[PDB]
Amino acid sequence: AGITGTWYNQLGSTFIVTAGADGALTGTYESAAGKAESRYVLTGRYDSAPATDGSGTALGWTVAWKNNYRNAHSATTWSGQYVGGAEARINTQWLLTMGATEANGWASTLVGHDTFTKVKPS
Amino acid sequence: AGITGTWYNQLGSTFIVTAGADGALTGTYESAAGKAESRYVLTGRYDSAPATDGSGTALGWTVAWKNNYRNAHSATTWSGQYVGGAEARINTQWLLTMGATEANGWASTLVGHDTFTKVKP
Amino acid sequence: AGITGTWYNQLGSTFIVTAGADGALTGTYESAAGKAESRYVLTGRYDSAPATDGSGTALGWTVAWKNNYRNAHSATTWSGQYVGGAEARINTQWLLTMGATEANGWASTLVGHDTFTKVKP
Amino acid sequence: AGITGTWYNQLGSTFIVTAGADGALTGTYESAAGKAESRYVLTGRYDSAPATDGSGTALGWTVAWKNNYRNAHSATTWSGQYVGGAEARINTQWLLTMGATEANGWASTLVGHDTFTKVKPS
Ligand SMILES: O=C(CCCC[C@@H]1SC[C@@H]2NC(=O)N[C@@H]21)NC1CCN(c2ccncc2)CC1
Ligand SMILES: O=C(CCCC[C@@H]1SC[C@@H]2NC(=O)N[C@@H]21)NC1CCN(c2ccncc2)CC1
Ligand SMILES: O=C(CCCC[C@@H]1SC[C@@H]2NC(=O)N[C@@H]21)NC1CCN(c2ccncc2)CC1
Ligand SMILES: O=C(CCCC[C@@H]1SC[C@@H]2NC(=O)N[C@@H]21)NC1CCN(c2ccncc2)CC1
């Protein structure tokens, strides 16, 4: 309910998601950055019965960066929580793993943090 | 290919996954550590057309730590890659986020690394 | 250049640092969050000859959470870069490791991100 | 005492460190991987009065990847703990930040994990 909708992060990427009764997140992700174009399938999970003490709602989702137009041989997982209120927000940290050989595994994973709100960028 | 089946990490957790033709990962996770018991639903994605240059196959999945027995108000995502061969493995790094108040948000996320193999430790 | 001085992050912590000619960072950290009080010693390194292409200046530092008042048996490292300009900032990600038994090692490391500015929040 | 010495990680990198009475780590790092050659200065901190319940000793250190031969405009911090015993070990996770513009900040930080032991590679 509160999670379902269209969200945008600080890069201008577009996160369209539906939070289902079974605890699943399903939708599409469009990244404004990197080796990506148009929409990618996402799937994830969220806590469908969160605490009522003011705590956020834990969640996560994955995008593999392959669609009909491009394959960047990589995947990002976002782990975070939804925080409701006047300015609802999803605060995340993410891990992006690139397909790599063994000589290059050490350099295979980027880390970052994305904040999502429902405010469409200008 | 090669991803579908049962995998074990260094903690003894059991990762049961099916890699579908549409790039989907679907299965169950049983953690040997933390506030967890029995199996939890997992869903994720993998590169269904990986490079042919010897690179691994990038993938990720999520578990929310709620099932019919308990709810630990948290979720873990594993991000990594499958590497095939005689000693196949899925090498991952993970982020566990706990549902938290704003006063405790700074301390809400654990990070780690799990190595999954076809043979238990 | 531009690094030496007092900085504040979004939690209200105070980062007092001197960037030396030898690439060293030296100063004190006062955390507004966690098991911490008063100042802690910090030491780190920065690129003393950064690129001239508009890139930030890479740097990192460590605090062990022991001083003469308390010891929280943990240490944080911040890894990031200084970006100069009208709204200068040091953008970081951090890893806090707690001294832990092997049974709790999987849960020993927190991860986060701190943005430091010259103006308090 | 237990921390002071020469350590090697799974990549074959060489970590020469002295743990001082003031809580400081000082020494040199030589990376077997990446845009690095010869030795780099490191500095860090460790818990000089760790717990006595079997817990490890928390510590961290930083290398900026500039020396007299090369500058890779980047820095790595390792955060971890020393675990004593028959096979003493330093278990770490690390963050490597590369100098970047604003268009590229999202991709500026690699993450990984290094295990150090005193066994010299063959
Ligand atoms: O780029 C992608 C796919 C798109 C990822 C978009 C990322 S997901 C976390 C963050 N949040 C967003 O909303 N968007 C970004 N994958 C590899 C390709 C090789 N990489 C580079 C980087 C820089 N230059 C050249 C090559 C590293 C990343
Ligand atoms: O334990 C779980 C759920 C099971 C996580 C299992 C983890 S997934 C990565 C790793 N790989 C595995 O195979 N297993 C482990 N959630 C905790 C998180 C930490 N929590 C707190 C809260 C307050 N203070 C301290 C800690 C709250 C609940
Ligand atoms: O709090 C501190 C020391 C101060 C850390 C302050 C942190 S540094 C990154 C961030 N940026 C700041 O400016 N401030 C915060 N150490 C804790 C770690 C968590 N600990 C446990 C143990 C068991 N269960 C749960 C948690 C043990 C002690
Ligand atoms: O490489 C370095 C400096 C050496 C880092 C060595 C790393 S520290 C953590 C790990 N533990 C070790 O012992 N060693 C490795 N810095 C940038 C340069 C640009 N980068 C690449 C990567 C791959 N191809 C091309 C360019 C990313 C990294």
Numbering used by the authors:
A (entry chain A), D (entry chain A): 15 to 136
B (entry chain B), C (entry chain B): 15 to 135
What text appears in the publication on this structure?
We describe here the use of an artificial cofactor employing the well‐known biotin‐streptavidin system to catalyze a Baylis‐Hillman reaction. As protein host, we chose streptavidin, as it can be easily crystallized and thereby supports the design process. There are several examples using streptavidin as the host for these cofactors, since its natural ligand biotin binds strongly (K d∼10−15 M) and is easy to modify with catalysts at the carboxylic acid group. No enzyme is known to naturally catalyze the Baylis‐Hillman reaction, a very versatile and atom‐economic C−C bond forming reaction for the production of various functionalized compounds and intermediates of active pharmaceutical ingredients (APIs).
We chose a derivative of DMAP as the artificial cofactor due to its low steric demand, which will facilitate its inclusion into the protein scaffold. The protein host around the cofactor was rationally designed on the basis of high‐resolution crystal structures obtained after each variation of the amino acid sequence. The location of the catalyst is in a shallow cavity at the surface of the protein. The system was evolved through repeated cycles of mutagenesis, activity tests, and structure determination. According to the presented structures and calculations the catalytically active site is too shallow to undergo interactions with 1.
